Subunit: 332 residues, 4 copies
């Protein structure tokens, strides 16, 4: 009899229950790992699954993480090239994508990514049919649409990180300017993720007091404080970070973990995420854009309809036309 057989005795004759809040992260590059590390440290999952085509790198990250088990409240951390390791996941974060190339059209980049998703997505759904897909891959808005198409899942179970982090970045800068914690500064950045995103000036407030009211010119050329530059810094953040260190990851990881917390714990919290906006704000095309949504364990179950100005609804309609412009040329 081994030490284990002499020390521990199995007394259950019932089949093991299986994970309750399993999370899978596709792509263990810096973004994937930042999300994984954030999810582990915040004790959100009872089982973390990792997958990536680069086998050695995947095995090393998983191994590195498993060695810290003593400091975590996660039952197990699994990794493998075969997607069967992701079975029964509640949430699957997709960070994988195509490595851009030399002067390659945007339609070709997107199509390259689509081809990558044609493998990934169907393999994810085979082992976790009741999951919720959280797409982080860029371009996020269109790629979320692709994931939604290829998966066959209802809209509530396919979400894009959208402008979740850009709104957090806005609140942070707003916080540094006012001298108060970002969680007390309210502001929303919606629309298309990137340079075309929309800062909704009418909602910027502290304790329910809107700053636009105190400065009606806020966000325009007539602004004596140039708030427009704050949103400009939000869109140029990733670029600035990359110019300084080559990649961007920590902020995105905390944002993804934040989204997973609301999903896993069924919080029903409002987050600006990418979802189907067809029929909203004059948008009639089948595109995904960021708007405030309610997240829980059933996914994106509710969408907030914002009171937007003609100029704002217009920017959204324009972004939607650009996305659809690429989407209608794709082969799914």
């Amino acid at each position: 009899a081994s030490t284990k057989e002499k020390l521990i005795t199995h007394v259950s004759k019932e089949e093991p229950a299986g994970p309750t809040n399993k999370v899978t992260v596709v792509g263990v590059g810096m973004v994937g790992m930042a999300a994984a590390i954030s999810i582990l440290l915040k004790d959100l999952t009872d089982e973390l699954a990792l997958v990536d085509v680069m086998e050695d790198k995947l095995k090393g990250e998983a191994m590195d993480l498993q060695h810290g088990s003593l400091f975590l409240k996660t039952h197990k951390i699994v990794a493998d090239k075969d997607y069967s390791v992701t079975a029964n996941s509640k949430v699957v974060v997709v960070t994988a994508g195509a490595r851009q190339q030399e002067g390659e059209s945007r339609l070709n980049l997107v199509q390259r990514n689509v081809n990558i998703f044609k493998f990934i997505i169907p393999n994810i759904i085979k082992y976790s049919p009741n999951c919720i897909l959280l797409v982080v891959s860029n371009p996020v808005d269109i790629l979320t649409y692709v994931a939604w198409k290829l998966s066959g899942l209802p809209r509530n179970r396919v979400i894009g990180s959208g402008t979740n982090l850009d709104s957090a970045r806005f609140r942070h800068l707003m916080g540094e300017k006012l001298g108060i914690h970002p969680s007390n500064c309210h502001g929303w950045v919606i629309g298309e993720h990137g340079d075309s995103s929309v800062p909704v000036w009418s909602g910027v407030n502290v304790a329910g007091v809107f700053l636009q009211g105190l400065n009606p010119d806020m966000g325009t050329d007539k602004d004596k404080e140039d708030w427009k530059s704050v949103h400009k810094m939000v869109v140029d953040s990733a670029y600035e970070v990359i110019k300084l260190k080559g990649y961007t990851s920590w902020a995105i990881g905390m944002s993804a973990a934040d989204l997973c917390q609301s999903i896993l714990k069924n919080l029903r919290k409002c987050h600006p995420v990418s979802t189907l906006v067809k029929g909203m704000h004059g948008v009639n095309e089948e595109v995904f854009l960021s708007v405030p949504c309610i997240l829980g364990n059933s996914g994106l179950t509710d969408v907030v309809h914002m009171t937007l100005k003609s100029d704002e609804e217009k920017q959204l309609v324009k972004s939607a036309e650009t996305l659809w412009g690429v989407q209608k040329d794709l082969t799914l």
Copy 2:
């Protein structure tokens, strides 16, 4: 027309998924509420259900907790006299019991408790057939056995709090004695909860260093440092708190929340809990006593076999015999 309707639009077609880690607490006395506040403050559940026999108190406690929602990460808190409110619980903490009466025999008291359980246990199982029962009511060892028989549940899903807190109290006292945090002081109190519990001196250590190795007289009459007084302080703990403030609640509440976390998060952690021990250390009847067990989302799946001194086993057998003697005279 509604303000809600104009602001929020439900976009899901799927029926809501339901709770993933629901917890029910039976009895809203001091012990039950302490457990409830401990489970909520530690973000262990997405839905807490409370049930008791008094409508107003039950409703008052729920309302008080609900008013604190802003500070919690629990989707909802519900309470009712009807057990249907506890549907789909993963863990059900049972604290309900009969108030003691002077001049009463031990048998009457235990039967009174059984009478209560005959109404309660089947109600729980009807709505949560796949739950894990955590019995905290006293006498915990006999009452856990009763819940096991009445529930019809397999042994791995019926657990008694047993000596979990008494071991924690022992580690706390040991800690105060050596000047270090209780999590670094290791010691186990097993067997029958209370006066007849057994402190396993051979396991008492810090960083793996046997304290009995440094003082072989430890725990005996020859013991010059009188460690026996530490174990006597443990068993007398409830009594002392009771005659100072009137009852005990906080330590038990923290203790139950600790057990729930191991179970809800499938930690497979070792806890000294009450479980069936027939066939161990000489016990030959179906009785529940405390021994180190491994707990997860499948319940109590493994038991650790400690190597005990024939003397230590003798106390366990005497206890078993005392417990069996009472069980045969009960009316289920």
Copy 3:
């Protein structure tokens, strides 16, 4: 010779550093203990001190909490009738007060409380001259003013719980109404704590969307959705819980712990707390009312100036006048 001596050797030459975030709770009634259990379960302090006038109860509560040390991350929990036990506290939560008496005038009740504070306040300051006083006792607005005068402390270090919980209750009710988490529902209840508090309808929003924008009649007689009943439910909350369970405690405890966290962790977060408002919204006397303030380790360092409707300010002035009327008749 000692077992301790052979096992552990003290190797420091320096005297121990003392606590860095010590918290004291004055009064161990239901409210005080709820605050104590909330502060400990959320790992906010390295040393918790309890003080009250009854030796046995005080000692019983401390012992109960100490028995749960294994499950906590607080170095020590101490309790005594002598205020020297509260030395070097960063935050002192004051909940002590006079039990009400039927047929009693408002003035007698408040004076009775002042009589209590004249003994308590100087004792606290003698041992913790650099603490931040958090007054929770009712009537909080007048009693915070009294603590300020008696303490001799600068305004930034004397805070009243004010409408912090009532605003949380409002966000909770709003949340239940719209079907989303209270942290996503924004609304502020300011002014005099209780019946005369003011709900600032202009600030009520979700994701920055003015609900008053969608329903301008919100809060008035023309209001078809009767939002006024939500604010009336807030003010009637304590009363309802009181006649159901006998007292309130949990929500207040969570509320105080929330305020302590902002202060202990220097978050500079916005909270609706009671502070000196002379010179704001027309108030001309030294009275404390609730308004949004920024809290950190330096205390209440900044106050937010909400743009209120002349009608809203009128209620604040009426309150100020009612409060001043009572303060001039008090004997400090």
Copy 4:
């Protein structure tokens, strides 16, 4: 008047208090960042300071981290090439070091590191004289000694990560073998960090039951289970991870954060860390080796004296001679 001057009013006339639990991380390479990220996610500090000679990389990491402020409870995150930014730190984690070279003697590598520390250490002590230095740089044992010499701080305030992580790795593997959480598997790896470390077989236990007792041959050639290979995997872990992904970081980061938690919160917890062992286990040279110690806010205030076998004390004496062999040739 700006929006800020009209919205927020400073009401404090007292000097700001300053950080209470500030932490500085020297070297923002992967190890530094893994530690920083672990410290932030576990809400341990109210101010995180980062420093590194590589200015761009430093600015990018800090920037990346600051953008996630909304998801953290840390007042501020600062970074700079000038050490004045680290003023008033409670704990300073040193990860910086010399980049090894082609067939360079060990004495020269160490001396190169010493030269790096001759700048760093005195700059750290200039701005934070009352801090606690936590050295992670390899070779950790000797480098901790160097830091201690150059700083002039008492031994309780200069600690080396030592075998903290290797013991965690041991407990993890032990856990995977037995099928239980690592926090329930006790085992200690002491001595010199690396291939010469010592696994203390007599302390390996589960619930106080030692495995050596159940298998007296445990750890020797006569072992029928080859436990010696478990310790072999612990020493070869870093290498295996690096062969798979080029670097090692996550496990080390969680371990450092774990150490900082005990220090910052004055937990008085037992950790196997590197400290002055002169006078212990036959060691008479002035060297640092890992042994179980008690950590709190005064630093390493206590050392546990383990009951070790002649063969074990010997390995320690040998390691100490090797370290001293290098140390006596250094120019500090």
